[PDB]
Amino acid sequence: VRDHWVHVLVPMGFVFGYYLDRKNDEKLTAFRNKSLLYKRELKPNEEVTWK
Amino acid sequence: TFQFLPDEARSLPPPKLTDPRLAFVGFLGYCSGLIDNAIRRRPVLLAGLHRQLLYITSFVFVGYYLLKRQDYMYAVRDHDMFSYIKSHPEDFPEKDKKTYGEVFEEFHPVR
Amino acid sequence: MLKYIIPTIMLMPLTWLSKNNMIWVNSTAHSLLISFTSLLLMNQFGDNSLNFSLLFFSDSLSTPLLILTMWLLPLMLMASQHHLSKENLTRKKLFITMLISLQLFLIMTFTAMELILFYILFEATLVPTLIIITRWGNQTERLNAGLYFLFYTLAGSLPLLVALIYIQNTVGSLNFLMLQYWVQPVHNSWSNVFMWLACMMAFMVKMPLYGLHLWLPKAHVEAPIAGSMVLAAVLLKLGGYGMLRITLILNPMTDFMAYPFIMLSLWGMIMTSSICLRQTDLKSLIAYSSVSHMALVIVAILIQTPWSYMGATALMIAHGLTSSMLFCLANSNYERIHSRTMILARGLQTLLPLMATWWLLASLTNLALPPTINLIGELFVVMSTFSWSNITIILMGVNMVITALYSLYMLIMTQRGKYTYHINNISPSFTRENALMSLHILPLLLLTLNPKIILGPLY
Amino acid sequence: DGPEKNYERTMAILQIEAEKAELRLKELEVRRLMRARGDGPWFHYPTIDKELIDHSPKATPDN
Amino acid sequence: MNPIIFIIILLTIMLGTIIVMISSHWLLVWIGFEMNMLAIIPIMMKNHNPRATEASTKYFLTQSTASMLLMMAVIINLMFSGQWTVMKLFNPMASMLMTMALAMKLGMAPFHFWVPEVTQGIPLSSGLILLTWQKLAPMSVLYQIFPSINLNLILTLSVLSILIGGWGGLNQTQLRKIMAYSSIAHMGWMTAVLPYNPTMTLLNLIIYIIMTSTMFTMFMANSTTTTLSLSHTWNKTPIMTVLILATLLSMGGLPPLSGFMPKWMIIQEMTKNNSIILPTFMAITALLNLYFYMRLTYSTTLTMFPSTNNMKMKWQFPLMKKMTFLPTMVVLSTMMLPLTPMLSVLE
Amino acid sequence: RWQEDPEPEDENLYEKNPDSHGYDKDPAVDIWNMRVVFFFGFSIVLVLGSTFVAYLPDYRMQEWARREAERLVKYREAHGLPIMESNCFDPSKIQLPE
Amino acid sequence: LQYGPLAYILGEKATKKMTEKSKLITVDGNICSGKSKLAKEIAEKLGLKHFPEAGIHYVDSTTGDGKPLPVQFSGNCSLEKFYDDPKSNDGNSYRLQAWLYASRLLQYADALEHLLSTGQGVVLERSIYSDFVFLEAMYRQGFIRKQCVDHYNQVKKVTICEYLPPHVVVYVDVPVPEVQSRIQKKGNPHEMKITSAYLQDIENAYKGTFLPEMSEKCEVLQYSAWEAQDAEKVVEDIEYLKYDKGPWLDQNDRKLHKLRMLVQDKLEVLNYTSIPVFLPEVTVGAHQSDQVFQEFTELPGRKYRAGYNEDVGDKWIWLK
Amino acid sequence: KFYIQEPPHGSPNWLKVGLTLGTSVFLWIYLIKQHNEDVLEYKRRNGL
Ligand SMILES: CCCCCCCCCCCCO[C@@H]1O[C@H](CO)[C@@H](O[C@H]2O[C@H](CO)[C@@H](O)[C@H](O)[C@H]2O)[C@H](O)[C@H]1O
Ligand SMILES: CCCCCCCCCCCCO[C@@H]1O[C@H](CO)[C@@H](O[C@H]2O[C@H](CO)[C@@H](O)[C@H](O)[C@H]2O)[C@H](O)[C@H]1O
Ligand SMILES: CCCCCCCCCCCCO[C@@H]1O[C@H](CO)[C@@H](O[C@H]2O[C@H](CO)[C@@H](O)[C@H](O)[C@H]2O)[C@H](O)[C@H]1O
Ligand SMILES: CCCCCCCCCCCCO[C@@H]1O[C@H](CO)[C@@H](O[C@H]2O[C@H](CO)[C@@H](O)[C@H](O)[C@H]2O)[C@H](O)[C@H]1O
Ligand SMILES: Nc1nc2c(ncn2[C@@H]2O[C@H](COP(=O)(O)OP(=O)(O)OP(=O)(O)O)[C@@H](O)[C@H]2O)c(=O)[nH]1
Numbered sequence A: 001v002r003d004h005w006v007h008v009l010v011p012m013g014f015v016f017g018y019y020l021d022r023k024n025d026e027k028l029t030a031f032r033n034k035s036l037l038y039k040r041e042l043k044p045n046e047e048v049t050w051k
Numbered sequence B: 001t002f003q004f005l006p007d008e009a010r011s012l013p014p015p016k017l018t019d020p021r022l023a024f025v026g027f028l029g030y031c032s033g034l035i036d037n038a039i040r041r042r043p044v045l046l047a048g049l050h051r052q053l054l055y056i057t058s059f060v061f062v063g064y065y066l067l068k069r070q071d072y073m074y075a076v077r078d079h080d081m082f083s084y085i086k087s088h089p090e091d092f093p094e095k096d097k098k099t100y101g102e103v104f105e106e107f108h109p110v111r
Numbered sequence C: 001m002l003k004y005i006i007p008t009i010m011l012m013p014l015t016w017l018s019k020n021n022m023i024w025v026n027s028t029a030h031s032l033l034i035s036f037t038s039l040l041l042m043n044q045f046g047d048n049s050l051n052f053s054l055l056f057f058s059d060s061l062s063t064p065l066l067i068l069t070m071w072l073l074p075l076m077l078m079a080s081q082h083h084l085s086k087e088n089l090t091r092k093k094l095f096i097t098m099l100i101s102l103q104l105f106l107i108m109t110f111t112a113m114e115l116i117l118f119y120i121l122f123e124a125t126l127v128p129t130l131i132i133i134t135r136w137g138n139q140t141e142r143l144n145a146g147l148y149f150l151f152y153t154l155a156g157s158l159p160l161l162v163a164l165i166y167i168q169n170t171v172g173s174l175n176f177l178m179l180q181y182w183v184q185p186v187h188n189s190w191s192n193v194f195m196w197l198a199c200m201m202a203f204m205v206k207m208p209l210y211g212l213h214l215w216l217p218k219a220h221v222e223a224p225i226a227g228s229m230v231l232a233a234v235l236l237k238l239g240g241y242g243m244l245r246i247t248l249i250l251n252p253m254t255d256f257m258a259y260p261f262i263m264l265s266l267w268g269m270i271m272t273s274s275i276c277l278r279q280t281d282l283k284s285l286i287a288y289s290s291v292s293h294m295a296l297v298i299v300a301i302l303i304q305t306p307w308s309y310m311g312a313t314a315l316m317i318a319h320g321l322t323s324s325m326l327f328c329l330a331n332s333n334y335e336r337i338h339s340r341t342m343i344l345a346r347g348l349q350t351l352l353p354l355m356a357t358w359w360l361l362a363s364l365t366n367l368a369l370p371p372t373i374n375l376i377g378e379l380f381v382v383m384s385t386f387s388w389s390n391i392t393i394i395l396m397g398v399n400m401v402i403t404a405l406y407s408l409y410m411l412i413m414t415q416r417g418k419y420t421y422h423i424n425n426i427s428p429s430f431t432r433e434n435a436l437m438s439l440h441i442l443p444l445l446l447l448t449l450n451p452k453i454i455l456g457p458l459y
Numbered sequence D: 001d002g003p004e005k006n007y008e009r010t011m012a013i014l015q016i017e018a019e020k021a022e023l024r025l026k027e028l029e030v031r032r033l034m035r036a037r038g039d040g041p042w043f044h045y046p047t048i049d050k051e052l053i054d055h056s057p058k059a060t061p062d063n
Numbered sequence E: 001m002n003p004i005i006f007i008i009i010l011l012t013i014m015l016g017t018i019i020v021m022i023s024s025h026w027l028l029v030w031i032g033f034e035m036n037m038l039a040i041i042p043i044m045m046k047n048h049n050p051r052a053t054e055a056s057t058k059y060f061l062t063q064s065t066a067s068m069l070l071m072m073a074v075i076i077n078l079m080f081s082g083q084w085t086v087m088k089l090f091n092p093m094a095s096m097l098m099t100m101a102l103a104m105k106l107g108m109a110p111f112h113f114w115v116p117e118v119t120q121g122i123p124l125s126s127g128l129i130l131l132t133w134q135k136l137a138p139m140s141v142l143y144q145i146f147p148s149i150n151l152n153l154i155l156t157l158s159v160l161s162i163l164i165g166g167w168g169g170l171n172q173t174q175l176r177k178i179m180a181y182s183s184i185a186h187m188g189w190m191t192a193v194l195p196y197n198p199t200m201t202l203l204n205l206i207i208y209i210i211m212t213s214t215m216f217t218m219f220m221a222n223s224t225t226t227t228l229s230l231s232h233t234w235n236k237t238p239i240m241t242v243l244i245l246a247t248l249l250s251m252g253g254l255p256p257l258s259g260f261m262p263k264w265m266i267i268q269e270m271t272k273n274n275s276i277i278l279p280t281f282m283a284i285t286a287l288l289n290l291y292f293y294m295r296l297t298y299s300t301t302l303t304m305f306p307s308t309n310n311m312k313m314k315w316q317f318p319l320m321k322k323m324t325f326l327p328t329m330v331v332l333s334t335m336m337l338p339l340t341p342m343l344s345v346l347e
Numbered sequence F: 001r002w003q004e005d006p007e008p009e010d011e012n013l014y015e016k017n018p019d020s021h022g023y024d025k026d027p028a029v030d031i032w033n034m035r036v037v038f039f040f041g042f043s044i045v046l047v048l049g050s051t052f053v054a055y056l057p058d059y060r061m062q063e064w065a066r067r068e069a070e071r072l073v074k075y076r077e078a079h080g081l082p083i084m085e086s087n088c089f090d091p092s093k094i095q096l097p098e
Numbered sequence G: 001l002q003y004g005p006l007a008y009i010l011g012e013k014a015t016k017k018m019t020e021k022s023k024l025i026t027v028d029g030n031i032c033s034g035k036s037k038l039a040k041e042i043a044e045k046l047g048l049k050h051f052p053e054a055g056i057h058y059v060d061s062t063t064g065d066g067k068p069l070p071v072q073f074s075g076n077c078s079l080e081k082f083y084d085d086p087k088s089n090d091g092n093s094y095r096l097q098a099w100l101y102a103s104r105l106l107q108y109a110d111a112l113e114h115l116l117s118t119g120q121g122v123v124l125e126r127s128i129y130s131d132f133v134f135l136e137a138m139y140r141q142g143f144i145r146k147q148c149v150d151h152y153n154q155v156k157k158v159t160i161c162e163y164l165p166p167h168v169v170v171y172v173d174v175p176v177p178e179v180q181s182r183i184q185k186k187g188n189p190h191e192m193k194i195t196s197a198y199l200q201d202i203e204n205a206y207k208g209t210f211l212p213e214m215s216e217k218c219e220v221l222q223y224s225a226w227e228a229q230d231a232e233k234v235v236e237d238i239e240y241l242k243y244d245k246g247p248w249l250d251q252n253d254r255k256l257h258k259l260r261m262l263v264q265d266k267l268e269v270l271n272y273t274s275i276p277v278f279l280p281e282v283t284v285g286a287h288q289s290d291q292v293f294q295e296f297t298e299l300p301g302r303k304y305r306a307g308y309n310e311d312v313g314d315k316w317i318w319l320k
Numbered sequence H: 001k002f003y004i005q006e007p008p009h010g011s012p013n014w015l016k017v018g019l020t021l022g023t024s025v026f027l028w029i030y031l032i033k034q035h036n037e038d039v040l041e042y043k044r045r046n047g048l
């Protein structure tokens, strides 16, 4: 609607911001399942421990 | 000698066309387009879209090559530094590292 | 933090692309939504901080300051939209843009992992703040207040820049997580004395420390209401937050370097509290009250104990809401009588009964009635300074007496007694004004039910 | 986020920052040595190029 | 001036500078300065009035004296090394003479007196060339001879210029004189870092040129040469006042604006060399410049000064001046800080 | 002296609109402004936000620490071990100077 | 090609278009002297463009849709008020005179631009050269202050020096008793309040300062009320002029290129009419000027640069 | 016909518009081809 299309700007900014925060995590996986505290074996269907 | 991007720079990966720095350069080009409309008292958002497009494209085009030189100059800096360290091992000895159990640090109470 | 930076940025296209008559409605609604999402930063752990990326992290210190910052933006829009009604549309949008850009800098400032990044954003907040005061302040003296504000900050912050760059050369990093592990003790020397002063003076000027506080009463008397709210609520806390971080790398030199600044604060709070008893301008009185409350925070930060750090954090949050309330209460009188003189309009409880209740509640938090978080923060500081030296209780106790006297004096003078005969335009409190007052006090009093979330990392 | 993700994400941040800090300290040391000794590619101030010299027999022999 | 002649004279100004920048022989460097000085005098004189004649004459005497001193340094250098290659000089007396000659050409304190007077006496477009393009040739020579420059001399010239430039601008109401004293102060930053990292000299020079060009262009768009005239802009081109405000805050070195970058990087390079007192003194002294930049913002953008009735007649006509590159220059003048690492292209 | 407009008279919003909420002169905008503030401010942020805070999952691990302390006190007292030792770190892992 | 150096380089030189008929003619005289009718006849017979005397709304006629704007957008200058209350405390007398000089300066720039761009001459009724006679008359009747005259001379000093004087000055010489007779006959209620002393001061300035001055540099032709009816004789006098004085003989393509660059840029033309001299009569407070400027931007076709106003039917804005 | 005088920008300058859009289009093709040739040269030199 031409009346209420401005109301998606900030909610879409949050979704885009949320998405980019998750993308940031994919660049910081050098130690995923490699810390002495949390390192373990993968479950049969598990590919990664977190994403 | 007097070369913007010497041939050895082609061994480096090119900057991605979605580089966040390149996007910012494009945004600066967009802002210049609006300020052009404003100083000449045109409708800021709609006026001359052909002109607004070239502002973005020009900024991105020049920005892409400036980013390429930027990355190459930092690759050269690292290349020079690592070669010099290899050439002069006596000046960069591998440090003998002790654990905190062996190292003595004074305690400064907060009382 | 991108989930907060981007929607904050999107507030600017929203304001500029809104219908002419919907700029306040739209900007207020969506900045309240941003404030709602900021409660996700409460995912805090007992050992580790919330480390988002290479640029931004959040911990128990920055999280409460972040939530206060994002809550204040809609409150500032509510407070400003009335005195800006005559302003033309484009300048209204420019005002809102300055508020939005201030929030963007603030949320980045409080989450910046690297100290030089913190510096740039810490400095960036000056620009919009100065513009708000000088452009939209009401009186001739806003220009002088702008200059004093600008140059007091830069006189201290430029030496901080040199010190920070020097630390990075020596240590190799300014990342705060790195400094937690690579910190080395600061030995006695004249070079280290001036490194300590460069690392601290900028934050002292912002708090402000007694003796470097004269810019703050000026700034408040000249700022518009939104300027006063953000100045008192958040911008003062940039100094406290900065001090809480940088003191990590100044040990053990802080043991003796803090003495002159503890004396200035301990004696400063009694002087500024006493000064409040004689102030004739209501905004100036609230401004001097801030200096006294923040003198407690400086002492707490400088003596570096778990109890003092918990008290400092609670005080910063509690004072932020209380002082912002008091400015909003004083402004609502100004919008009727157009004077800041405290003795001009008296006996307002007879004419504005519900507004007098907000006045009572704000005053009670200002004097730290238990169990408000204002009292929790003050008490934790008093407990920790007693161990530092038992004699401090005398100074702390005297300030508590004086604080009650000037808080109730302000309540008595303006709300009680006889109304002024010739002031016949005291129109009933608007829904906007009542909602603005309650949006301060209600979160403030609700925090008493779960104080741990405003007690900081040492909790 | 679960504590494990934040914990190991923190380690990845620390590794990057620690590596950058070491490189910053090494660069300051390398620059200090190259400037004092002149044996590196940095601080290489030009000297006259020897390809400008004419080596042919001259009008007179003693040169 | 005939438009074709004006073009050829502008190209000769540029050619003289280019000759200085591409030359390996000291004589060609001297020729580049001579050709450049010959071609710039006609654009100082173009408006034909006693003030423009005085400025052109004061400029000629200063630059001619500096070029004679430069040729002395070159000839002394030839006597003691037998060569003309543009590089380090081979005699300390020659180095002092060339350093002093180049300081005179740049208008550095205490050889600064001509800059405010010459800039005041010439048109805005000519002042734009004087305070930007003309800095290129002398700075490019300093870039190449800095190993042999006396450290105490160059740092003394830098410190004096930052003080004189800062103090001199406080007393000014003429915009051309404000820009002149602002130029003097900025030259001091450029030469203070030159002994440590010439790259940072280039960064400061480029950014200074960009912000200086922006300000001169905005003054030219409105034909404003005085503070009070500039104070009428709000009642004619409100957008221009905002651009002026942003650019002045950038020239003040305020974060997050582009003008913070050169001061930021110069302080870094000096601290890496254990220079702490000097950068701190420079940064605090630069607050003098911020003061009289802020004064201009008060009278231009942050307050509305009194207007005149005849101003209403101006509301009916649009800006017809070229304002070439202004939208690009203003964005670079203010919004470049996030791209600071790009300075490595200048390495 | 000069040609300047006179100071306007301050307008009481209640004259034109006795139902004014004090947000806007336009009654329709005024009511909407009141509604977003009251709904997003009180109904959402303060009510749901207070509820969200009330149910934060063991904020900063205080509850886990108490459970862990109970487990250690139980095991240590069963085995006749000190409840807590003065030494945070094992002395055999420390090499003192001199 | 919009005029500029590129157009000049490519052969758009003034001497090409200008003939012996490319003359700037100005008609002067006292009030009700019949100069308006004579000016039209001269222009018709010689095929020149006629400019009606620039009044309070001259600038409106050259911009927008050409229609006059409300009075607040001219500062509330009123010639009617000047006759009713020439000594009004609101400074209307000099505010009008300062505004009228700027209007004449704008018209002179338009006339020169027409002459230099087309080669066709123009006929003006009074000009920036004769505007001072009204100011001197005003001062001598005590209608304006000495500081107003000092302000007027400052603005004139830095503006008139840029332009060339008329080729021909035509003066119609009607004595004051006759002028007053023609004023009462015309029957304009406000004009009849004019004093013969004010009219005598206008004539004294004309004959004391104007005509002697212009004689040094122009061709000055003088006619009586009777001699001015014979337009053909006036035109016969004009066509037989020698044109042996003045700076128009020194002009050349180079100098006329600079002149055309000036007169075509109207903001550059009016630059010094707003010098920051804070005279009470012409100074406008910030709040008023701000309020009036916002109103002006709301006028039809005035928010944006001409050609970019969708509210008055401009199209293809997204490609312009 | 609202304006008393014809505006200098009454109608678009179609030659300028064609040059403007043509320049934008050309710059993107050159940039895209430059990027592709850079990606291939990078892969060849590194054996990928
Ligand atoms: C997750 C995002 C949440 C964002 C929340 C944002 C809240 C925004 C509140 C908007 C207030 C409503 O805004 C207003 O509503 C009405 C009905 O829809 C619209 O339409 C109105 O037009 C005219 C009134 O002139 C009438 O026909 C009638 O009153 C109504 O239909 C208005 O044009 C619009 O301005
Ligand atoms: C390729 C690079 C260029 C990219 C350009 C991408 C965006 C292009 C947008 C074109 C349409 C802009 O729209 C133009 O500006 C605004 C917002 O719509 C409108 O005018 C506006 O006035 C006020 C706000 O000032 C509001 O009522 C509302 O926002 C709107 O009506 C204009 O009437 C419209 O003509
Ligand atoms: C210790 C760290 C912080 C130190 C900061 C000190 C730097 C200077 C801050 C203020 C700068 C203001 O700059 C200038 O100061 C003077 C007074 O000081 C002001 O002037 C004001 O006080 C003077 C002196 O009583 C009066 O004559 C004047 O009428 C009044 O306006 C100027 O209007 C202001 O332009
Ligand atoms: C501002 C004055 C302008 C007028 C200039 C007048 C001309 C100046 C002529 C300078 C030429 C002489 O220059 C000077 O010659 C002597 C002769 O060996 C040099 O040598 C002298 O100093 C060096 C020091 O290591 C040694 O050679 C030796 O101790 C001594 O002889 C100087 O290093 C050189 O600086
Ligand atoms: N104060 C003032 N009035 C002016 C000026 N120019 C014209 N006027 C007035 O404008 C009115 C018309 O001027 P005239 O052209 O001389 O009278 P006219 O009868 O209509 O024209 P003619 O028949 O040619 O004489 C007169 O009342 C003039 O006084 C001026 O520069 N200053």
Ligand SMILES: [Mg+2]
Binding pocket: G035, G036, G053
């Ligand atoms: Mg007439």
